[PDB]
């Protein structure tokens, strides 16, 4: 099933054989950048020819890329560094992948081994360094482990609770001669050991029963349904409950669909968190009960019975304690309850209609909205624009702040893996790097990055690559010459005192700065600026139907908040639903 | 002697504490980009009359940035950045400040104290992340150590060896009101008990003695005498003794000098690096005996009687074991020595000029050349000019590379600190940045960045930062469209293979890319491009003269290799001293 | 409501602030050896008039007296030790209480500051050594937090799961003058923060509804319980629900009661562990779900709803993923439970009675049992006769092995906290001290040390402090001349081969070695030697109506196994019920 370019009895070097690894596992795709401890892995690499490497412009748009290209197609992100500077570029990365549970390998070259703790050229401790932001690390001390410990990192990195794996590699072991044996066992039994075994009727049939005997029932979606798409939603075809999604979850289930209550959270609707705020039953799946959600634990779905099915223990009871727990897949759950929900339809007899309308009243009453002065563009409606035009089945990454929240708000999701967002550590920059991997994943995809002038420029680099990979990326950047989010807490928090939230240039404080149309012209990309909300679908139009990379510059009046808004920490009743910076 | 802007019984928050305790201790710059957890903090800083802040594009920046104003300064440099995202992208900075010993505090904010520890929104144990990249660092758990841990931070920032110290501030202690006892003594019983006491009489005559007996003296500076500008050379003029510096120590002793036998080591002149191989006695002050500059150890001064003087017990005889050691500073030391030179001149009769003569020969049949190709222009001979033009008085930063290394040969350093370079680590895109913190430092300094087409686009975000702040900073592009440092070894030791070193279109093989000057243009700052060597000098003159910033596209043959060059833990006779790319 | 030896304005020694932290906390008695580190702290402790020092033999009889002190009274036990040997000899005691749940402070001496980490004199990084084991550890680093640190300790030690804490002090903190500020806020927001909140009454509903549609219910308790012993006993009252204990949950229901199954686990007795295996309901209060337990996970209560009570998150769902959980005080659950089951008789009608018959039959096919050979002494029958002649109501304390087993198996315990013994690390030796511990803390009680040859030697000089202090502790010494639970395992999984499992001298193997009677002789306390059956009852009694520490050698066949007996990880259908070593 697999054909090596040497033979089984031809010794090469480490690094070849890390090569191979990869190939074995799969991998077609890596993002690295060349350094001096690496230099062997990238000869290595350009000896083989199922795998590419996309050379990013910076160590950090290598991390961002993979986890584009991970999260978007579900399969683990692959980037390789050289050591020291290179190495500590990819942390940001890291810590992002760990917090969102996306799968990531990545790869990095140290000095030689005697070289090791001497402050040697360009060495950093960074197994040292990332082992509280990675799910696991090594350090190779013998090319005879290379094969194994490949093996074991992706094996660690896409299993359970998907993460960050980061495997250091000394030039001296990349170079050294060796025959490997892939037949190598992994070493993992504690792990193996605790791996979730798949649900029992027993658990799922009680939860069956808590719905039949609930009249309020709301679903709680996470990240962890991204692979659970189909059993999800005939699991509410066959229960008629409301789906409440979380930033992670959206496209779990369709945003479009009448049963959706979209997102709930700090920037959740008025309905999403109303439901959650009066559920009798919560039906947490595959999330992970975060601050932006819950806000005050106390407060958060106080009056309801609590099922929360998660692949981690350590999440099950870490937040809020359950009256009902299953450790293990949500996807095998969902498929568990789902036969038992066909085979009992008939004494079942489901029907929350009353609470379903309870809630479209509410959905009626405070639904999402946004203001338009003038011929100015509501970020909001160009986003919606987007979604129209691209009939939502655009795959969409974003950089952090308020574009992020009305991308999120503003576009509904067909399917999981469209939406592509940093969202427990909530890293700027990582919109246009992301989008990158993503493109690369999906070829034939409309991949557009939703950016902010903010984040977009701290990756700006990545253009070039982009040009030169030839990637048909989108740029939709909602310029508002602000640091959106900082300055809407200025505003209701701080009386509007500016603290180094303005990204333009003081001197001409009317004047776009920097003109973001000549970063793209920098890298021979396609670019124009819209203003007017007239000119908006055309120009949208247009990067659509240009074929290639291309960058829309949506000018934004900076007054626009993000609303609703539950203050952090607070509690549904908190919750703020008007106002702006004007 | 200080000024509040609080009643000394008046209580304040805890942001505003940890400004007053930076005014106080005479910050007057800081490089901070607001995010959520520290918006206390930058609102703190605007109630502040004494502070500036300089906004960066990217923490990254941030960190660079204050590496460049206390390198340039010889004071501490100033980040702080939010959680989470903020703090991981400061990493690079921070190993980067450690590795060189430059005195660094860098502040981050953090979740509630409460919310540590459970996963919270943008939070990182940054503390566990950085403790193995930092000189030391702290989270802040009360508010009443506010005064003492800043106190102490820039204590052992700035005291013996030079590094960078982080402090983790939780939000809830930015907001604690409290009233500041400034008054708090330090616990640092440990450090300050182990710190080097002035050296000994007994110590340092021996060391003349040594000198007095010796007939091949060699002076091995390095980093730790960017203080020591006046006494060392007192010291050579005493003694008459060639030295030869590190990349860490140029303009400890003027380049230009006579008695200057410049850089030593894998890229150091062939009569340097053959002074150290043939002394009788090496006088290694203020270095660390780096692999770049020993190559194989037992090769390395193996006939000569070494005398080692470092602020770190622990660098003495870390690497090579000397003859004679003093820990201690070198600036003591050196005046110490210069007294008892100067009081047995008489007896001494330092007479060393059949070594100098010897090396002069030396100096005379291998010195310093590259090639001119029709009208290329010669990357060398662009900071042969720039030497020229301004006198040999700008303040010069770089990135990494070839770059790096011809800026570091063809430039004669006048005083110290006037080279900024990542030297340790390496890191690129540093040369940017750190420029930006220099120019702040020196206003009215002439600052060029003699960078790297890959090392300036990785941070080329600080564009929009230089003309926002106005600083007249100079950038000299060497551009090569590659990885040159890295091509070099390809060539060198892989057959030229090319394994991802180009950074230009290889749609357009025969084009620049990126297109430099439309960065430039994007943010406001004038450049041009140069091609002819003919041209260079008016192009040069041209960017010096025009106020502000400026950034000049130096075009350049790839092929160039720099020379000389002692491969990775070669010996001297191992140099090589002829070939390139072509 | 407290009065200190000093003003309010009186400055003194960190020492004597550190023990009035002490009594300010209640303590009246402390287990500490002088050593030079700790010499102040003994110098402080003779200044107070309300803490006693009970001086042991050796560190370790330290912790495992303060062990027995805790774990006998429900207070927090105190150790003192010097620094260096001192410190590193409680190692064990503290990995102990942390295993078992035990509240410990432990104190322990550390050279000056200045010399910390200078490898001075008597000097190991204990708080670096003892972080693993330990439920937290603290290095004061100045006098002025000594108020704090043993406040926080304290409450760590209590709250919540109950565990060891060590404070590290250094010699010249304990030096240095000042006057303690006992005003000072305790810095634990997020443990506190943390803290379980009392259960509600939804969830507790929720179980009350579980035990109502049960047939088969079985009660799981362990050592959560200790301090549940009335709220328990009301709520098996009121249900009538079978109670199967773990080792550390002895005594929290009357081993003596009809619904009483006794102990479950490797050696717990057939019926208890038939009742799990087959049990539809498991109501698991205060217990870990400990491997010697539940065997093979997947097999231990496969066929029932698991309910489970834990004072630690941690806990639930770490072996065992419960169909309901509950983060919390048991206490406060059994509480909230009893009112509901009251005030709900009526309706509900519980009635176990078959379940229970079920169960009362196997009690009667297989009881514990024992069997007597001629006039040999069956150590079951000398700890059933103790059992007699002290009317079960004394404290036992037991070494670790097959006599331990014994010990729990036949003696019923009345009450909790009556049962001394070290289940999750099991350490020999802790049996001695522990007895110690307990009696300084029940003066009145009978405290009766059930120890084996092995493990009582292993600690024989606290026979010493016994004497000195006058403690009426009586030693009931299963002399087997072996190490008994291992030979136990020899016999059956490795063909009886002996390798180093028998205790006495080769050169006499029919010859009782040591001769303990000579131990007891050596430190002034009476004792006996018993070897027929016949004579065990007068010569147990004689130990009893003895006044004064007593010790009884009874010697046994060294033959005997603790049954019944399920292999590591089995099955209940792998209960070993015959043999021995014959
Ligand atoms: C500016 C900003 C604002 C934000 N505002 C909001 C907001 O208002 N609302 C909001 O929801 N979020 C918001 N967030 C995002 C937020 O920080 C959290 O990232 C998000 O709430 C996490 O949701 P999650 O727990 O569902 O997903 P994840 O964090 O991805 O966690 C998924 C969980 O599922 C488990 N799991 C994984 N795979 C499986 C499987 N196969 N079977 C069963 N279980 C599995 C995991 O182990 C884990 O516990 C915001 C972020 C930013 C940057
Ligand atoms: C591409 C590349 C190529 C390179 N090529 C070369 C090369 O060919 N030659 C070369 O020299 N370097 C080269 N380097 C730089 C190299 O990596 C090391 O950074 C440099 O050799 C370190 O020199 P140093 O030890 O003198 O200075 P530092 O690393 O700054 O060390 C200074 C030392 O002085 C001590 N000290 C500090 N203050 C005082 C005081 N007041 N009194 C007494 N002692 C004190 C310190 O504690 C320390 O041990 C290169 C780097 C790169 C990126
Ligand atoms: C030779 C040998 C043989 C052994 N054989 C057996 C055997 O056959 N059977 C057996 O049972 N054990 C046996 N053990 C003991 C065994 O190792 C474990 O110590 C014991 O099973 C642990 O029981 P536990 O979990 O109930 O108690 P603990 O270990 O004390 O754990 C108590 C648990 O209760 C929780 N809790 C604490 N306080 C409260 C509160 N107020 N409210 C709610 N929850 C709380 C804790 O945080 C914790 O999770 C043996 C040990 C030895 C040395
Ligand atoms: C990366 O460093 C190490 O891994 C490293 C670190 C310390 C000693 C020896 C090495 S090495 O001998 O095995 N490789 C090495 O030195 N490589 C390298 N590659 C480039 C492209 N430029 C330069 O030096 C200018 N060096
Ligand atoms: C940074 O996070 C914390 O420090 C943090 C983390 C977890 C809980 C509570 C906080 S907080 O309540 O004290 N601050 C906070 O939440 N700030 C904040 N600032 C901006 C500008 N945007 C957003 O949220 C979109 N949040
Ligand atoms: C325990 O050591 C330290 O704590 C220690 C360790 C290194 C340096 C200084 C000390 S100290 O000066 O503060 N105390 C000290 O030296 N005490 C002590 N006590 C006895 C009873 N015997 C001996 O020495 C034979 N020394
Ligand atoms: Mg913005
Ligand atoms: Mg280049
Ligand atoms: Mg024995």
Redesign the pocket.
Known sequence: TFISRFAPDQPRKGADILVEALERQGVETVFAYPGGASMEIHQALTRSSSIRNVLPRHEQGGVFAAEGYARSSGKPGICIATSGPGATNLVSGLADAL???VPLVAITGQVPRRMIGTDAFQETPIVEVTRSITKHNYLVMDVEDIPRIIEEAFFLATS???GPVLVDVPKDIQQQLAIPNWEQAMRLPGYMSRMPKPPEDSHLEQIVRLISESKKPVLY????????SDELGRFVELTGIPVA?????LGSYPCDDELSLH??????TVYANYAVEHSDLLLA??????D??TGKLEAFASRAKIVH????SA?IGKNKTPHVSVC??????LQGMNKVLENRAEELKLDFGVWRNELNVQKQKFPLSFKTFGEAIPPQYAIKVLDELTDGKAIISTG??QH??WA?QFYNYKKPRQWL??????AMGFGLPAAIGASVANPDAIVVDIDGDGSFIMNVQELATIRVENLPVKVLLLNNQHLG?VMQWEDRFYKANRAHTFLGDPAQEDEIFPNMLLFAAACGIPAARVTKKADLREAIQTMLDTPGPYLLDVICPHQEHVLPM?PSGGTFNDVITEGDGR
Request: proline share 2%.
């Open positions: 917090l969102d549970s359970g609770r998907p979606v996470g990240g962890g349904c991204l692979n659970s999604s979380t930033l992670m979850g997102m709930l959270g700090m920037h959740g799946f595959g999330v992970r009960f975060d932006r959600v099915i998660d692949i981690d999440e293990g897949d949500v996807k095998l759950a952090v702040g992020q929240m999120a967002s940093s969202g427990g550590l909530g989010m539950i």
